[PDB]
Amino acid sequence: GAMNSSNYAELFNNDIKLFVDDTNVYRVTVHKTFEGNVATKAINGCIFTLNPKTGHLFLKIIHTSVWAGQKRLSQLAKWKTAEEVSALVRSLPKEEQPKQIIVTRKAMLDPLEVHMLDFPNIAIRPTELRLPFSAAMSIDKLSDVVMKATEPQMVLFNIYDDWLDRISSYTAFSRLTLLLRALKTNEESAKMILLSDPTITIKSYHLWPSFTDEQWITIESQMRDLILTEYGRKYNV
């Protein structure tokens, strides 16, 4: 059944699993027309498919051409997501195929179950966790490859950089979710915290800065403070 606080360590066991987030698949700017009506313009999107144990991120870029001449795009976006995840699973060798796919939004369950009928042994699960994967487009290198795409494209990343050399998957996932939670709550503040000290750089093959163990503790402290402040403000507590 559903993934929650109670069955959290299952994410870091040796059963292959993927999180799928569809929140950045269909993206629009809303604008006024000459006649003063409102219209949308689609912009490039992405499926965020993540192995939480390894950090492997399968970023399927969704080019605006896929929406051309289609109706009910928010509904189509769920089915396109399920079609692309299904095509990804079929592209992987049998020993690399996931035993579970966890969708971050319940509306993905039926589209994914129907696209994966060929894989009756792959469990399709919801989660009660409120995961901040919508903030993936606040990671500058991910945002850049999506916005420059001129055609459909799959790009592979490790969202943990080299952290797994020093920390466990559990700890790597906790750092990732804290960084994304910060970026989602106050993007400008979060990005100031990450880049303020120009001596710490982002390696060409990495997404995040090259912090020491000590500098990560300070960074992680600054992100928790950012999140609690914004909470007090949101709620006047």
Place this chain on the structure above:
Amino acid sequence: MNTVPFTSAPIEVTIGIDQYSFNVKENQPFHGIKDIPIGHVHVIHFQHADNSSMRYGYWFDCRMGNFYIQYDPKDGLYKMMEERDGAKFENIVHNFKERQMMVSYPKIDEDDTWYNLTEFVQMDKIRKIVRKDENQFSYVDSSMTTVQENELSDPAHSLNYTVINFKSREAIRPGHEMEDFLDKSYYLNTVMLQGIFKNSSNYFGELQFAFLNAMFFGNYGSSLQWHAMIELICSSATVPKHMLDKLDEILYYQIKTLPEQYSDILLNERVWNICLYSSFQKNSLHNTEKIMENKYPELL
């Protein structure tokens, strides 16, 4: 007009014959049911006064043989049996009629209720859903499970309704996943009507049989089957116009007949709300929508 004699009534029981029912007392001189309309399938059903659990009964057609009921004190139930000796049977029935020990099938002349509930139901189709080929009649009860229920355990005593599953390879063509899931016309028209049922009459026949088993025996798997067959039609954008017109009539008489007090366990809120208000056919079932809105507005 045909007769189903009873050897005796040793135990106190509520006897149903189609939509009618009679209380019989322990050792009441009751010898059966006469004036049964020829031309239709019938069901004769039982609920013991001492165990209101296990409704059970027998689907039959008097054109297919001479049937009687006899209590079996070992198995503790009223059993249907065939009498092969035509003369012994006419002789038994004539005696019981002369002594007026039989209830009369109480049809009102104006009243087409039973025809309207059984229009497409044929004994030969009932005998394929309820497999017991040595009898010409079919036993059903409250507890019998469906082939589909057994997949999710004794196959001899199962209801072999056609398996409908909206999230199955049968229902969904590779490469038309979204199309076939949101518009079930492919599944209804090609797989089910052309492929399995052969025509809409057999489809309606199973639907009507599933409803009647749900209503008369509170058979939960039959209720699931009735709703699945409704939802497959209402979830198809493309349905022959005669099928929609006939489905509206079928469902109208089913909703009309359903006991008011059983609406809560026999009607699935999600299916009815979807079929009348969201589905492709939301504007195609005028009679059914009007009777549902006036009789069960709570459900909606």
